[PDB]
Enzyme design. Structure first.
Site: not given
Ligand SMILES: [Cl-]
Ligand SMILES: [Cl-]
Ligand code: NA
Length: 129
Positions: A35, A46, A48, A50, A52, A59
């Site tokens: 990750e 991301n 959309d 958002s 991380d 998220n």
């Protein structure tokens, strides 16, 4: 902070992640490796809108507040910047809520695609725990 592999394994064990909800330590180290490359300061945006955050790439759509994900929730009740600390406590406490929400570690795409079904014990080999 960029953790060593055994350093991170030891920090996760102290914070109660070994065997948490049935997931051995190697799973958590494996997920962190893919990750964030063990980097607490990793961020990724991301599609959309958002973002991380941190070594487990939590998220902002659901888990933390960064003030720029409209209509999102903050289920871990933390600013997303707390997930970037050299102190992994906030990330671990929040990951505990995520993995307990019914979907286990499948919440972490890299865990699903790169750790699940592999010999995750390899990730803690040779470490003093
Ligand atoms: Cl393991
Ligand atoms: Cl992946
Ligand atoms: Na949020």
């Amino acid at each position: 902070k960029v953790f060593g592999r055994c350093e991170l394994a030891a920090a996760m064990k102290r914070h109660g992640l070994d065997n948490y909800r049935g997931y051995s330590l190697g799973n958590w180290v494996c997920a962190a490796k893919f990750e964030s490359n063990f980097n607490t300061q990793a961020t990724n945006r991301n599609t959309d809108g958002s973002t991380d955050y941190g070594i487990l790439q939590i998220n902002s759509r659901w888990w933390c507040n960064d003030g720029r994900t409209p209509g999102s929730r903050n289920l871990c009740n933390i600013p997303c910047s707390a997930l970037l600390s050299s102190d992994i406590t906030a990330s671990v406490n929040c990951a505990k809520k995520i993995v307990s929400d019914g979907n286990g570690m499948n919440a972490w795409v890299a865990w699903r695609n790169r750790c699940k079904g592999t010999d995750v014990q390899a990730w803690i080999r040779g470490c003093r725990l």
